[PDB]
Write a protein that binds this ligand. Structure first.
Ligand SMILES: O=c1ccn([C@@H]2O[C@H](CO)[C@@H](O)[C@H]2O)c(=O)[nH]1
Length: 193
């Protein structure tokens, strides 16, 4: 059903990308894995790093594609199909250009919103997965997007994102329990200050 049992974090592999805004999804899933003691180990079969563990009495899988962002579907799609995880049980955490640092929202359905990771996923499994939209801000102009998402945020913006991510971690219990409406209410209500 809508008991979240796959949590995907989008991002790029390599130390040079680890601190960039486009890896917001990785930050969330890495922190979630540490919170619940889920081992994120090499998963060559699905071109990623993945884990499996107990979150609040539920068997949950975690996935970080190691395909580079624009090829994220080349991990997520075969992984979800192999383990027979329907989109309705998937949460994908990703950076959101259309939201401020420190703003975070749970969304069900919808398009990719210009996001090149999601762009590679929705064509295959459809739109009906859940998304943890982690606000990163927009660089104003259209052609400066690459420089923004592949940039390391200033400390204040990082602090704002980190606080929002921490808040979201506290609400994963609701999501794995299938309380998507309550999780949406409580996640979306987050304020940094
Ligand atoms: O060295 C790089 C840098 C970025 N990109 C791709 O360009 C996307 C913008 O989403 C990237 O994040 C990633 O898929 C690469 O393929 N290689």
């Amino acid at each position: 059903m809508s008991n979240i049992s796959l949590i995907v974090g989008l991002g790029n592999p390599g130390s040079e990308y680890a601190q960039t805004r486009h890896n917001a999804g990785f930050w969330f899933v890495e922190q979630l894995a540490d919170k619940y003691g889920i081992t994120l180990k090499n998963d060559p079969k699905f071109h990623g790093i993945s884990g499996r563990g107990n979150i609040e009495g539920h068997d949950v899988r975690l996935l970080l594609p190691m395909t580079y962002m624009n090829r994220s579907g080349q991990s997520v799609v075969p992984f979800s199909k192999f383990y027979q995880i329907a989109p309705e049980a998937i949460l994908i955490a990703h950076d959101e250009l259309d939201m401020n640092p420190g703003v975070i929202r749970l969304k069900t359905g919808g398009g990719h919103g210009g996001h090149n990771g999601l762009r590679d996923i929705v064509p295959h499994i459809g739109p009906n997965f859940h998304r943890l939209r982690i606000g990163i801000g927009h660089p104003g102009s259209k052609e400066r997007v690459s420089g923004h998402v592949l940039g390391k945020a200033p400390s204040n913006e990082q602090s704002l994102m980190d606080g929002a991510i921490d808040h979201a971690l506290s609400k994963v219990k609701l999501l794995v329990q299938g309380q998507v409406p309550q999780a949406m209410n409580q996640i979306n209500a987050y304020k940094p200050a």
